[model samples]
Target: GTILIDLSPDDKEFQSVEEEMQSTVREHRDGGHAGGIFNRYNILKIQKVCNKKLWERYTHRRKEVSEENHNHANERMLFHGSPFVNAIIHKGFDERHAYIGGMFGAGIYFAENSSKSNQYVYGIGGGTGCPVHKDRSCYICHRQLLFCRVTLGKSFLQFSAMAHSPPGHHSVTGRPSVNGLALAEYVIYRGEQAYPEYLITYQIMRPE
Candidate 1:
Protein backbone atom coordinates (compact mmCIF):
# COMPACT_ATOMS: atom_id res chain seq x y z
CA GLY A 1 0.00 0.00 0.00
CA THR A 2 1.42 3.35 -1.08
CA ILE A 3 0.27 6.89 -0.28
CA LEU A 4 1.14 9.58 -2.76
CA ILE A 5 1.14 13.15 -1.50
CA ASP A 6 1.16 15.96 -4.02
CA LEU A 7 2.29 18.70 -1.63
CA SER A 8 5.76 20.18 -1.94
CA PRO A 9 8.05 20.23 1.10
CA ASP A 10 7.69 23.98 1.59
CA ASP A 11 3.93 24.01 1.30
CA LYS A 12 1.71 24.12 4.40
CA GLU A 13 0.12 20.91 3.17
CA PHE A 14 3.51 19.27 3.53
CA GLN A 15 3.03 19.08 7.27
CA SER A 16 -0.24 17.28 6.77
CA VAL A 17 1.41 14.89 4.30
CA GLU A 18 4.22 14.12 6.72
CA GLU A 19 1.75 13.48 9.51
CA GLU A 20 -0.23 11.12 7.31
CA MET A 21 2.90 9.23 6.33
CA GLN A 22 4.02 8.98 9.92
CA SER A 23 0.59 7.81 11.07
CA THR A 24 0.48 5.23 8.34
CA VAL A 25 3.92 3.97 9.25
CA ARG A 26 2.94 3.75 12.88
CA GLU A 27 -0.26 1.88 12.01
CA HIS A 28 1.70 -0.58 9.88
CA ARG A 29 4.33 -1.13 12.58
CA ASP A 30 1.57 -1.68 15.14
CA GLY A 31 -0.16 -4.14 12.79
CA GLY A 32 -3.16 -1.83 12.19
CA HIS A 33 -4.60 -2.57 15.65
CA ALA A 34 -4.52 1.08 16.61
CA GLY A 35 -7.86 2.16 18.10
CA GLY A 36 -10.24 4.85 16.84
CA ILE A 37 -10.46 6.70 13.52
CA PHE A 38 -8.40 9.56 14.99
CA ASN A 39 -5.74 7.17 16.24
CA ARG A 40 -4.03 7.81 12.93
CA TYR A 41 -3.38 11.48 13.57
CA ASN A 42 -1.90 12.21 10.17
CA ILE A 43 -4.72 10.54 8.33
CA LEU A 44 -7.25 12.53 10.31
CA LYS A 45 -5.47 15.71 9.34
CA ILE A 46 -5.41 14.80 5.66
CA GLN A 47 -9.11 14.00 5.84
CA LYS A 48 -9.68 17.68 6.48
CA VAL A 49 -7.95 18.49 3.19
CA CYS A 50 -9.22 15.71 0.95
CA ASN A 51 -12.74 15.01 2.22
CA LYS A 52 -14.11 17.38 4.82
CA LYS A 53 -17.58 15.86 4.66
CA LEU A 54 -16.28 12.41 5.44
CA TRP A 55 -14.29 13.85 8.32
CA GLU A 56 -17.40 15.49 9.72
CA ARG A 57 -19.29 12.24 9.36
CA TYR A 58 -16.66 10.42 11.32
CA THR A 59 -16.65 13.07 14.03
CA HIS A 60 -20.43 13.00 14.23
CA ARG A 61 -20.45 9.25 14.64
CA ARG A 62 -17.73 9.44 17.25
CA LYS A 63 -19.66 12.03 19.21
CA GLU A 64 -22.99 10.23 18.97
CA VAL A 65 -21.63 7.06 20.53
CA SER A 66 -22.01 7.11 24.33
CA GLU A 67 -19.04 6.09 26.47
CA GLU A 68 -20.81 2.83 27.27
CA ASN A 69 -21.47 2.23 23.58
CA HIS A 70 -17.96 3.31 22.60
CA ASN A 71 -16.41 -0.09 23.10
CA HIS A 72 -15.31 -2.50 20.36
CA ALA A 73 -18.77 -2.84 18.84
CA ASN A 74 -19.22 0.88 18.44
CA GLU A 75 -15.67 1.25 17.23
CA ARG A 76 -16.43 -1.16 14.43
CA MET A 77 -19.36 0.98 13.44
CA LEU A 78 -17.18 4.08 13.43
CA PHE A 79 -14.67 2.32 11.17
CA HIS A 80 -17.43 1.81 8.61
CA GLY A 81 -18.04 5.57 8.64
CA SER A 82 -14.34 6.49 8.35
CA PRO A 83 -12.86 8.34 5.42
CA PHE A 84 -10.72 5.34 4.66
CA VAL A 85 -13.87 3.30 4.34
CA ASN A 86 -15.33 5.98 2.11
CA ALA A 87 -12.22 5.92 -0.07
CA ILE A 88 -12.52 2.17 -0.43
CA ILE A 89 -16.17 2.54 -1.38
CA HIS A 90 -15.37 5.28 -3.89
CA LYS A 91 -12.80 3.01 -5.49
CA GLY A 92 -15.52 0.44 -6.23
CA PHE A 93 -13.68 -2.50 -4.71
CA ASP A 94 -15.88 -5.57 -4.39
CA GLU A 95 -16.17 -6.47 -0.71
CA ARG A 96 -16.70 -10.15 -1.52
CA HIS A 97 -13.70 -10.24 -3.79
CA ALA A 98 -11.62 -8.41 -1.19
CA TYR A 99 -12.67 -10.90 1.50
CA ILE A 100 -11.76 -13.84 -0.70
CA GLY A 101 -8.46 -12.27 -1.67
CA GLY A 102 -7.62 -11.60 1.96
CA MET A 103 -8.23 -15.21 2.88
CA PHE A 104 -6.12 -16.56 0.01
CA GLY A 105 -3.48 -13.98 -0.70
CA ALA A 106 -2.88 -12.93 2.90
CA GLY A 107 -2.30 -16.46 4.30
CA ILE A 108 -4.18 -15.35 7.44
CA TYR A 109 -4.59 -18.80 8.96
CA PHE A 110 -0.91 -19.65 8.63
CA ALA A 111 0.31 -16.88 10.92
CA GLU A 112 -0.81 -18.54 14.15
CA ASN A 113 0.59 -21.45 16.28
CA SER A 114 4.25 -22.41 16.76
CA SER A 115 5.06 -26.07 17.64
CA LYS A 116 5.17 -27.89 14.27
CA SER A 117 7.83 -29.52 12.12
CA ASN A 118 6.78 -29.09 8.49
CA GLN A 119 9.11 -26.86 6.49
CA TYR A 120 8.06 -24.55 3.64
CA VAL A 121 10.33 -23.09 0.91
CA TYR A 122 10.57 -19.80 -1.03
CA GLY A 123 13.00 -17.30 -2.72
CA ILE A 124 13.35 -13.64 -3.89
CA GLY A 125 16.07 -11.56 -5.63
CA GLY A 126 16.47 -8.00 -6.86
CA GLY A 127 19.14 -5.30 -6.93
CA THR A 128 19.60 -1.57 -7.46
CA GLY A 129 22.62 0.35 -8.90
CA CYS A 130 23.92 -2.56 -11.01
CA PRO A 131 25.47 -2.44 -14.46
CA VAL A 132 23.16 -2.90 -17.45
CA HIS A 133 23.99 -3.67 -21.10
CA LYS A 134 25.74 -0.69 -22.74
CA ASP A 135 22.84 0.12 -25.13
CA ARG A 136 20.30 0.03 -22.32
CA SER A 137 18.86 3.29 -21.03
CA CYS A 138 18.15 4.01 -17.40
CA TYR A 139 14.47 3.16 -16.92
CA ILE A 140 13.93 6.44 -15.08
CA CYS A 141 16.62 8.81 -16.31
CA HIS A 142 16.78 7.44 -19.89
CA ARG A 143 20.57 7.81 -19.77
CA GLN A 144 22.95 4.88 -20.20
CA LEU A 145 23.30 3.27 -16.77
CA LEU A 146 24.12 0.13 -14.88
CA PHE A 147 21.44 -2.14 -13.44
CA CYS A 148 21.45 -4.33 -10.33
CA ARG A 149 20.05 -7.79 -9.61
CA VAL A 150 19.52 -9.40 -6.22
CA THR A 151 18.12 -12.86 -5.55
CA LEU A 152 16.86 -14.39 -2.30
CA GLY A 153 17.37 -18.06 -1.42
CA LYS A 154 14.81 -20.76 -2.30
CA SER A 155 13.21 -20.48 1.15
CA PHE A 156 11.44 -17.25 0.08
CA LEU A 157 8.08 -18.98 -0.43
CA GLN A 158 8.13 -20.42 3.07
CA PHE A 159 9.11 -17.06 4.48
CA SER A 160 6.43 -15.28 2.48
CA ALA A 161 3.71 -17.67 3.68
CA MET A 162 4.81 -17.38 7.26
CA ALA A 163 5.04 -13.60 7.23
CA HIS A 164 1.75 -13.02 5.43
CA SER A 165 -0.28 -15.61 7.33
CA PRO A 166 -2.42 -14.46 10.26
CA PRO A 167 -0.56 -14.18 13.56
CA GLY A 168 0.50 -17.36 15.52
CA HIS A 169 1.21 -19.76 12.63
CA HIS A 170 5.00 -19.53 12.43
CA SER A 171 5.60 -23.01 13.82
CA VAL A 172 6.57 -25.72 11.33
CA THR A 173 3.58 -27.88 12.38
CA GLY A 174 1.23 -25.07 11.37
CA ARG A 175 2.73 -24.46 7.92
CA PRO A 176 2.08 -26.55 4.82
CA SER A 177 4.69 -27.12 2.13
CA VAL A 178 4.22 -24.69 -0.71
CA ASN A 179 4.45 -26.45 -4.09
CA GLY A 180 4.50 -23.36 -6.26
CA LEU A 181 6.47 -20.15 -6.72
CA ALA A 182 5.60 -16.66 -7.95
CA LEU A 183 7.96 -14.21 -9.60
CA ALA A 184 7.50 -10.55 -10.49
CA GLU A 185 9.60 -7.76 -11.96
CA TYR A 186 9.05 -4.04 -12.28
CA VAL A 187 10.75 -1.30 -14.29
CA ILE A 188 10.18 2.43 -13.99
CA TYR A 189 10.95 5.06 -16.61
CA ARG A 190 10.34 8.79 -16.96
CA GLY A 191 10.88 9.47 -20.68
CA GLU A 192 8.33 9.04 -23.42
CA GLN A 193 7.51 5.52 -24.55
CA ALA A 194 4.60 3.53 -25.86
CA TYR A 195 4.30 1.70 -22.57
CA PRO A 196 3.48 3.02 -19.10
CA GLU A 197 6.08 4.93 -17.15
CA TYR A 198 6.52 1.74 -15.23
CA LEU A 199 6.13 -1.89 -16.25
CA ILE A 200 5.60 -5.00 -14.17
CA THR A 201 5.95 -8.65 -15.12
CA TYR A 202 4.69 -11.61 -13.13
CA GLN A 203 4.91 -15.38 -13.47
CA ILE A 204 3.87 -18.39 -11.43
CA MET A 205 5.36 -21.92 -11.40
CA ARG A 206 4.35 -25.17 -9.78
CA PRO A 207 6.49 -28.21 -8.99
CA GLU A 208 5.97 -31.29 -11.11
Candidate 2:
Protein backbone atom coordinates (compact mmCIF):
# COMPACT_ATOMS: atom_id res chain seq x y z
CA GLY A 1 0.00 0.00 0.00
CA THR A 2 3.02 2.35 0.18
CA ILE A 3 6.51 3.10 -1.09
CA LEU A 4 9.43 5.22 0.13
CA ILE A 5 12.39 7.04 -1.41
CA ASP A 6 15.15 8.86 0.42
CA LEU A 7 16.40 11.77 -1.66
CA SER A 8 19.53 12.76 0.17
CA PRO A 9 17.61 13.42 3.36
CA ASP A 10 21.22 12.40 4.14
CA ASP A 11 23.27 10.06 1.91
CA LYS A 12 23.42 8.84 -1.71
CA GLU A 13 22.28 5.51 -0.28
CA PHE A 14 18.64 6.22 -0.98
CA GLN A 15 18.96 6.19 -4.78
CA SER A 16 21.11 3.08 -4.72
CA VAL A 17 18.85 1.35 -2.21
CA GLU A 18 15.98 2.33 -4.50
CA GLU A 19 17.47 0.92 -7.69
CA GLU A 20 18.49 -2.35 -6.07
CA MET A 21 14.94 -2.69 -4.87
CA GLN A 22 13.30 -2.16 -8.26
CA SER A 23 15.22 -4.95 -10.00
CA THR A 24 14.38 -7.57 -7.37
CA VAL A 25 11.97 -10.47 -7.80
CA ARG A 26 10.40 -13.32 -5.84
CA GLU A 27 13.14 -15.90 -5.77
CA HIS A 28 11.20 -18.22 -3.40
CA ARG A 29 8.41 -18.97 -0.96
CA ASP A 30 8.54 -20.24 2.59
CA GLY A 31 5.81 -21.86 4.68
CA GLY A 32 2.42 -22.31 3.09
CA HIS A 33 -1.10 -23.01 4.28
CA ALA A 34 -3.16 -26.06 5.06
CA GLY A 35 -6.99 -25.80 5.06
CA GLY A 36 -6.99 -22.28 3.64
CA ILE A 37 -5.03 -20.91 6.57
CA PHE A 38 -1.48 -19.66 6.31
CA ASN A 39 1.17 -18.97 8.89
CA ARG A 40 2.35 -15.77 7.20
CA TYR A 41 4.43 -13.57 9.45
CA ASN A 42 6.75 -10.56 9.86
CA ILE A 43 7.70 -8.20 12.69
CA LEU A 44 9.98 -5.55 14.25
CA LYS A 45 11.59 -4.60 17.55
CA ILE A 46 11.60 -1.04 18.93
CA GLN A 47 13.67 -0.48 22.02
CA LYS A 48 14.58 2.60 24.04
CA VAL A 49 17.68 3.51 21.93
CA CYS A 50 20.14 3.54 24.84
CA ASN A 51 21.61 1.05 27.27
CA LYS A 52 21.73 1.28 31.08
CA LYS A 53 19.90 -1.56 32.78
CA LEU A 54 21.30 -4.79 34.09
CA TRP A 55 18.48 -5.48 36.52
CA GLU A 56 15.22 -3.72 36.00
CA ARG A 57 12.06 -5.38 37.18
CA TYR A 58 8.76 -5.08 35.37
CA THR A 59 5.63 -6.80 36.66
CA HIS A 60 5.90 -8.20 33.13
CA ARG A 61 9.65 -8.49 33.11
CA ARG A 62 10.50 -9.69 29.57
CA LYS A 63 13.74 -11.41 28.57
CA GLU A 64 15.24 -13.99 26.27
CA VAL A 65 15.16 -17.63 27.29
CA SER A 66 18.00 -19.58 25.75
CA GLU A 67 17.35 -22.83 23.86
CA GLU A 68 19.47 -24.54 26.48
CA ASN A 69 16.29 -25.15 28.47
CA HIS A 70 13.31 -27.50 28.07
CA ASN A 71 10.95 -24.90 26.56
CA HIS A 72 12.11 -23.49 23.22
CA ALA A 73 11.24 -21.60 20.04
CA ASN A 74 14.10 -19.36 18.85
CA GLU A 75 16.10 -16.41 20.09
CA ARG A 76 13.18 -14.09 20.82
CA MET A 77 12.25 -11.06 22.90
CA LEU A 78 9.00 -9.38 24.00
CA PHE A 79 8.09 -6.03 22.37
CA HIS A 80 6.12 -4.49 19.54
CA GLY A 81 7.19 -4.87 15.91
CA SER A 82 5.50 -1.61 15.14
CA PRO A 83 4.55 1.16 17.51
CA PHE A 84 1.21 0.92 15.70
CA VAL A 85 0.51 -2.80 15.52
CA ASN A 86 1.93 -6.15 16.62
CA ALA A 87 2.56 -7.91 19.92
CA ILE A 88 3.33 -11.40 21.14
CA ILE A 89 0.82 -13.97 20.00
CA HIS A 90 -1.12 -15.55 22.83
CA LYS A 91 -1.24 -19.02 21.38
CA GLY A 92 -3.93 -21.50 22.20
CA PHE A 93 -0.89 -23.37 23.39
CA ASP A 94 -0.91 -21.13 26.43
CA GLU A 95 -4.58 -20.26 26.48
CA ARG A 96 -5.48 -23.91 26.26
CA HIS A 97 -3.42 -24.35 29.36
CA ALA A 98 -5.50 -21.68 30.99
CA TYR A 99 -9.37 -21.75 31.04
CA ILE A 100 -8.75 -25.47 31.57
CA GLY A 101 -9.31 -25.73 27.80
CA GLY A 102 -7.52 -29.00 27.39
CA MET A 103 -5.08 -31.46 28.84
CA PHE A 104 -1.75 -29.68 29.27
CA GLY A 105 -2.32 -27.48 26.20
CA ALA A 106 -2.73 -30.11 23.52
CA GLY A 107 -5.29 -28.59 21.09
CA ILE A 108 -6.91 -25.38 19.87
CA TYR A 109 -10.12 -23.97 18.42
CA PHE A 110 -11.75 -20.54 18.05
CA ALA A 111 -12.59 -20.72 21.72
CA GLU A 112 -11.55 -17.09 21.43
CA ASN A 113 -14.46 -15.87 19.29
CA SER A 114 -16.95 -15.64 22.10
CA SER A 115 -14.65 -13.87 24.46
CA LYS A 116 -12.73 -10.57 24.00
CA SER A 117 -15.77 -9.05 22.35
CA ASN A 118 -14.55 -5.63 21.35
CA GLN A 119 -17.15 -2.97 21.08
CA TYR A 120 -14.27 -0.92 19.48
CA VAL A 121 -10.54 -0.50 18.67
CA TYR A 122 -7.83 2.03 17.54
CA GLY A 123 -5.35 2.45 14.63
CA ILE A 124 -2.46 4.52 13.23
CA GLY A 125 -2.70 8.15 11.99
CA GLY A 126 -6.27 8.44 13.19
CA GLY A 127 -5.18 9.17 16.69
CA THR A 128 -1.73 9.55 18.23
CA GLY A 129 -1.39 5.83 17.41
CA CYS A 130 -3.27 2.54 16.99
CA PRO A 131 -4.02 -0.89 18.45
CA VAL A 132 -2.04 -4.12 18.11
CA HIS A 133 -3.39 -6.89 15.89
CA LYS A 134 -5.62 -9.43 17.67
CA ASP A 135 -5.43 -12.51 15.43
CA ARG A 136 -2.35 -13.63 17.34
CA SER A 137 -1.03 -15.02 14.07
CA CYS A 138 1.52 -13.23 11.86
CA TYR A 139 3.88 -13.68 8.86
CA ILE A 140 7.15 -11.84 8.38
CA CYS A 141 8.52 -9.89 5.39
CA HIS A 142 11.45 -7.54 5.27
CA ARG A 143 14.09 -5.57 3.33
CA GLN A 144 15.82 -8.84 2.54
CA LEU A 145 12.96 -10.44 0.57
CA LEU A 146 9.25 -10.61 -0.16
CA PHE A 147 6.83 -11.84 2.51
CA CYS A 148 3.12 -12.25 3.14
CA ARG A 149 0.74 -14.40 5.22
CA VAL A 150 -2.82 -15.07 4.18
CA THR A 151 -5.33 -17.89 3.72
CA LEU A 152 -4.40 -20.11 0.78
CA GLY A 153 -7.65 -19.05 -0.86
CA LYS A 154 -7.98 -15.36 -0.22
CA SER A 155 -7.72 -11.99 -1.98
CA PHE A 156 -4.98 -10.85 0.36
CA LEU A 157 -2.97 -13.35 -1.60
CA GLN A 158 -0.08 -11.92 -3.55
CA PHE A 159 3.01 -13.65 -4.80
CA SER A 160 4.50 -11.22 -2.17
CA ALA A 161 4.74 -8.12 0.12
CA MET A 162 7.91 -6.21 1.02
CA ALA A 163 10.37 -4.02 2.95
CA HIS A 164 10.44 -6.01 6.17
CA SER A 165 6.70 -5.60 6.14
CA PRO A 166 5.27 -2.35 4.98
CA PRO A 167 5.77 0.55 7.34
CA GLY A 168 2.21 1.47 7.56
CA HIS A 169 0.32 3.92 9.51
CA HIS A 170 -0.95 0.32 9.94
CA SER A 171 -2.66 -1.17 12.95
CA VAL A 172 -4.98 -4.06 13.56
CA THR A 173 -8.72 -3.67 13.48
CA GLY A 174 -10.94 -4.58 16.46
CA ARG A 175 -10.43 -4.68 20.18
CA PRO A 176 -10.45 -7.40 22.78
CA SER A 177 -11.57 -7.55 26.33
CA VAL A 178 -7.95 -6.57 25.42
CA ASN A 179 -5.68 -7.48 22.33
CA GLY A 180 -2.28 -8.46 20.18
CA LEU A 181 0.71 -10.98 18.38
CA ALA A 182 4.49 -10.90 17.93
CA LEU A 183 6.96 -13.56 16.70
CA ALA A 184 10.51 -12.41 16.68
CA GLU A 185 13.95 -12.69 16.90
CA TYR A 186 13.85 -8.91 15.01
CA VAL A 187 14.80 -5.42 13.26
CA ILE A 188 14.79 -1.62 13.28
CA TYR A 189 12.58 0.50 10.98
CA ARG A 190 13.54 3.88 9.55
CA GLY A 191 11.05 6.03 7.72
CA GLU A 192 11.94 8.16 4.68
CA GLN A 193 12.21 11.36 6.63
CA ALA A 194 14.15 10.20 9.66
CA TYR A 195 16.22 7.28 10.82
CA PRO A 196 15.26 6.62 14.39
CA GLU A 197 16.80 3.85 16.43
CA TYR A 198 14.84 1.58 18.75
CA LEU A 199 15.77 0.54 22.24
CA ILE A 200 14.40 -2.74 23.46
CA THR A 201 13.34 -3.54 27.00
CA TYR A 202 13.30 -7.29 26.58
CA GLN A 203 14.37 -10.82 27.41
CA ILE A 204 15.77 -12.98 24.64
CA MET A 205 13.67 -15.89 23.36
CA ARG A 206 15.32 -19.09 24.32
CA PRO A 207 14.56 -21.19 27.33
CA GLU A 208 15.94 -20.22 30.69
Candidate 3:
Protein backbone atom coordinates (compact mmCIF):
# COMPACT_ATOMS: atom_id res chain seq x y z
CA GLY A 1 0.00 0.00 0.00
CA THR A 2 1.10 3.57 -0.62
CA ILE A 3 1.93 5.45 2.54
CA LEU A 4 2.52 9.17 2.83
CA ILE A 5 4.49 10.21 5.88
CA ASP A 6 4.66 13.93 6.38
CA LEU A 7 8.06 15.35 7.21
CA SER A 8 8.63 18.15 9.66
CA PRO A 9 9.75 21.33 7.96
CA ASP A 10 12.83 21.48 10.18
CA ASP A 11 13.83 17.89 9.55
CA LYS A 12 17.18 17.66 7.81
CA GLU A 13 15.76 15.53 5.02
CA PHE A 14 12.92 17.94 4.55
CA GLN A 15 15.21 20.94 4.54
CA SER A 16 17.50 19.43 1.93
CA VAL A 17 14.63 18.70 -0.43
CA GLU A 18 13.04 22.06 0.21
CA GLU A 19 16.29 23.85 -0.49
CA GLU A 20 16.70 21.99 -3.77
CA MET A 21 13.16 22.92 -4.80
CA GLN A 22 13.59 26.55 -3.84
CA SER A 23 16.86 26.85 -5.73
CA THR A 24 15.15 25.47 -8.79
CA VAL A 25 12.41 28.03 -8.41
CA ARG A 26 15.03 30.73 -8.30
CA GLU A 27 16.65 29.43 -11.46
CA HIS A 28 13.33 29.36 -13.24
CA ARG A 29 12.48 32.83 -12.09
CA ASP A 30 15.77 34.05 -13.47
CA GLY A 31 15.41 32.55 -16.95
CA GLY A 32 12.43 30.25 -17.52
CA HIS A 33 8.92 31.38 -18.32
CA ALA A 34 5.66 31.01 -20.18
CA GLY A 35 4.62 34.67 -19.91
CA GLY A 36 3.34 34.45 -16.31
CA ILE A 37 5.43 36.17 -13.67
CA PHE A 38 6.32 34.82 -10.26
CA ASN A 39 9.35 35.74 -8.16
CA ARG A 40 9.52 32.74 -5.85
CA TYR A 41 7.78 29.64 -4.54
CA ASN A 42 7.57 28.03 -1.14
CA ILE A 43 7.60 24.38 -0.20
CA LEU A 44 4.58 23.93 2.02
CA LYS A 45 4.83 20.21 2.61
CA ILE A 46 6.77 17.13 1.61
CA GLN A 47 5.46 13.62 2.01
CA LYS A 48 7.94 10.79 1.78
CA VAL A 49 6.48 8.04 -0.38
CA CYS A 50 6.50 4.44 0.83
CA ASN A 51 5.23 1.96 -1.69
CA LYS A 52 7.03 -1.35 -1.33
CA LYS A 53 5.24 -3.04 -4.19
CA LEU A 54 5.95 -0.28 -6.68
CA TRP A 55 9.52 0.14 -5.48
CA GLU A 56 10.17 -3.56 -5.94
CA ARG A 57 8.75 -3.51 -9.43
CA TYR A 58 10.75 -0.42 -10.31
CA THR A 59 14.04 -1.81 -9.03
CA HIS A 60 13.40 -5.09 -10.85
CA ARG A 61 12.78 -3.23 -14.07
CA ARG A 62 15.78 -1.02 -13.49
CA LYS A 63 18.05 -4.02 -13.06
CA GLU A 64 16.74 -5.62 -16.20
CA VAL A 65 17.36 -2.49 -18.21
CA SER A 66 20.83 -2.11 -16.77
CA GLU A 67 21.94 -5.65 -17.56
CA GLU A 68 20.32 -5.69 -20.97
CA ASN A 69 22.20 -2.60 -22.03
CA HIS A 70 25.46 -3.39 -20.27
CA ASN A 71 25.36 0.09 -18.79
CA HIS A 72 24.24 1.95 -15.72
CA ALA A 73 20.50 2.36 -15.25
CA ASN A 74 21.10 6.11 -15.40
CA GLU A 75 18.50 6.56 -12.76
CA ARG A 76 17.56 10.01 -11.60
CA MET A 77 15.10 11.43 -9.16
CA LEU A 78 12.94 13.62 -11.36
CA PHE A 79 9.90 15.83 -11.04
CA HIS A 80 6.44 14.83 -12.25
CA GLY A 81 3.47 17.17 -11.90
CA SER A 82 -0.18 16.26 -12.17
CA PRO A 83 -3.48 16.57 -10.43
CA PHE A 84 -3.73 12.82 -9.84
CA VAL A 85 -1.20 12.54 -7.06
CA ASN A 86 -3.33 10.05 -5.15
CA ALA A 87 -3.93 7.96 -8.24
CA ILE A 88 -0.21 7.66 -8.87
CA ILE A 89 0.57 6.98 -5.21
CA HIS A 90 -1.98 4.17 -5.29
CA LYS A 91 -1.20 2.69 -8.71
CA GLY A 92 2.15 4.13 -9.75
CA PHE A 93 2.59 5.91 -13.08
CA ASP A 94 0.17 4.53 -15.65
CA GLU A 95 0.38 5.16 -19.34
CA ARG A 96 -3.35 4.67 -19.70
CA HIS A 97 -3.85 8.09 -18.21
CA ALA A 98 -0.95 9.64 -20.13
CA TYR A 99 -1.65 12.48 -22.47
CA ILE A 100 -1.91 12.02 -26.20
CA GLY A 101 0.22 14.16 -28.53
CA GLY A 102 2.60 15.03 -25.75
CA MET A 103 5.94 16.42 -26.86
CA PHE A 104 7.30 12.92 -26.49
CA GLY A 105 4.10 10.96 -27.02
CA ALA A 106 1.88 9.21 -24.48
CA GLY A 107 4.29 8.10 -21.81
CA ILE A 108 4.92 8.79 -18.15
CA TYR A 109 6.48 12.23 -18.27
CA PHE A 110 9.02 13.83 -15.91
CA ALA A 111 11.14 16.94 -15.69
CA GLU A 112 14.54 17.66 -14.24
CA ASN A 113 13.56 21.23 -13.54
CA SER A 114 11.11 21.55 -10.71
CA SER A 115 9.54 24.64 -12.23
CA LYS A 116 8.86 22.77 -15.42
CA SER A 117 6.99 20.18 -13.42
CA ASN A 118 5.19 22.97 -11.61
CA GLN A 119 3.53 23.87 -14.84
CA TYR A 120 1.24 20.86 -14.51
CA VAL A 121 0.85 20.96 -10.73
CA TYR A 122 -2.77 21.73 -10.08
CA GLY A 123 -5.71 20.32 -8.19
CA ILE A 124 -7.76 17.53 -9.61
CA GLY A 125 -11.54 17.78 -10.02
CA GLY A 126 -11.37 21.55 -10.22
CA GLY A 127 -9.08 21.86 -7.18
CA THR A 128 -11.71 20.69 -4.71
CA GLY A 129 -13.33 17.56 -6.10
CA CYS A 130 -12.26 14.01 -6.90
CA PRO A 131 -12.49 12.07 -10.11
CA VAL A 132 -15.00 9.27 -10.67
CA HIS A 133 -13.15 6.11 -9.75
CA LYS A 134 -13.47 2.90 -7.83
CA ASP A 135 -11.44 4.30 -4.94
CA ARG A 136 -13.36 7.05 -3.22
CA SER A 137 -10.41 8.07 -1.05
CA CYS A 138 -8.49 10.97 -2.54
CA TYR A 139 -6.18 13.67 -1.26
CA ILE A 140 -7.76 16.86 -2.48
CA CYS A 141 -5.41 19.82 -2.21
CA HIS A 142 -3.68 22.66 -3.99
CA ARG A 143 -0.57 22.38 -6.19
CA GLN A 144 1.22 19.05 -5.87
CA LEU A 145 4.29 17.44 -7.41
CA LEU A 146 5.81 13.98 -7.49
CA PHE A 147 9.53 13.41 -7.18
CA CYS A 148 10.02 10.04 -8.86
CA ARG A 149 12.93 7.71 -9.42
CA VAL A 150 13.14 7.20 -13.17
CA THR A 151 15.43 4.76 -14.97
CA LEU A 152 16.64 6.22 -18.18
CA GLY A 153 19.02 3.45 -19.16
CA LYS A 154 19.98 4.88 -22.49
CA SER A 155 18.35 8.09 -23.58
CA PHE A 156 17.93 9.56 -27.01
CA LEU A 157 16.96 13.04 -28.06
CA GLN A 158 13.58 12.99 -29.71
CA PHE A 159 12.03 15.91 -31.49
CA SER A 160 8.61 14.46 -32.22
CA ALA A 161 5.92 12.17 -31.01
CA MET A 162 6.95 8.54 -30.40
CA ALA A 163 4.61 6.09 -28.78
CA HIS A 164 7.53 4.00 -27.57
CA SER A 165 11.23 4.26 -26.85
CA PRO A 166 13.37 4.72 -29.89
CA PRO A 167 15.34 1.79 -31.28
CA GLY A 168 18.08 0.71 -28.86
CA HIS A 169 17.13 3.40 -26.42
CA HIS A 170 15.51 2.98 -23.02
CA SER A 171 13.94 6.48 -22.94
CA VAL A 172 13.43 9.68 -24.89
CA THR A 173 14.00 13.33 -24.04
CA GLY A 174 12.68 16.70 -25.13
CA ARG A 175 15.23 19.49 -25.05
CA PRO A 176 14.65 23.22 -25.30
CA SER A 177 14.10 24.37 -28.84
CA VAL A 178 13.38 27.60 -30.62
CA ASN A 179 9.72 26.82 -31.12
CA GLY A 180 9.09 23.79 -28.91
CA LEU A 181 9.14 22.82 -25.27
CA ALA A 182 10.86 25.53 -23.24
CA LEU A 183 12.08 23.05 -20.65
CA ALA A 184 13.54 19.57 -20.52
CA GLU A 185 11.20 16.59 -20.34
CA TYR A 186 11.82 12.87 -20.03
CA VAL A 187 9.48 10.10 -21.13
CA ILE A 188 9.65 6.47 -20.19
CA TYR A 189 7.43 3.93 -21.90
CA ARG A 190 6.95 1.53 -19.02
CA GLY A 191 5.21 2.62 -15.86
CA GLU A 192 7.20 0.22 -13.72
CA GLN A 193 10.38 2.02 -14.72
CA ALA A 194 9.45 4.79 -12.31
CA TYR A 195 8.80 4.91 -8.57
CA PRO A 196 7.14 7.96 -7.10
CA GLU A 197 9.34 8.71 -4.10
CA TYR A 198 7.91 11.94 -2.76
CA LEU A 199 4.78 14.07 -2.85
CA ILE A 200 5.42 17.81 -2.64
CA THR A 201 2.77 20.46 -1.99
CA TYR A 202 3.81 24.03 -2.51
CA GLN A 203 2.81 27.49 -3.61
CA ILE A 204 4.17 30.10 -5.99
CA MET A 205 4.19 33.73 -5.01
CA ARG A 206 5.55 37.16 -5.83
CA PRO A 207 8.25 38.61 -3.58
CA GLU A 208 7.07 41.22 -1.09
- Candidate number of the best lDDT: 3
Candidate 2 positional error at 142, Å: 20
Q: What would the per-residue lDDT of candidate 1 be over residues 1-208, giving only the tens digit for each residue?
A: 2232334445675564344223321111222122211122212222212333433443443343323243321221001111122333223112232222221342111111100000000100111211352211112211110011111111122323322223322111222333122111111110000010101111111112
Candidate 1 residue spans exceeding 4 A from truth: 1-6, 12-49, 64-98, 101-208
Can you write out model 3's per-residue Cα lDDT over 1-208, one digit (the tens) per residue? 9889999987998987777666665344324233123445667889999988999999999999998779699898888877667799998888776554366777778887776676555432223223342221222324678888899998988664316788888898877655343456899888889999988887565546
The alpha-carbon RMSD values of the candidates against the true structure, listed in the order shown, are 18.6, 18.6, 6.1
Residue 135 shift from truth in candidate 3, angstroms: 28
Candidate 3 Cα lDDT to native: 0.72
TM-score quality measure for candidate 2: 0.18
Q: In angstroms, give how far residue 27 of model 1 lies from its true place.
A: 16
Candidate number of the best TM-score: 3
Error of 3 at 22 (Å): 1.5
Please tell me which model should have the higher TM-score, number 2 or number 3.
3
TM-score of each: 0.23, 0.18, 0.80
Cα lDDT over the full model 1? 0.21
Error of 3 at 208 (Å): 2.9
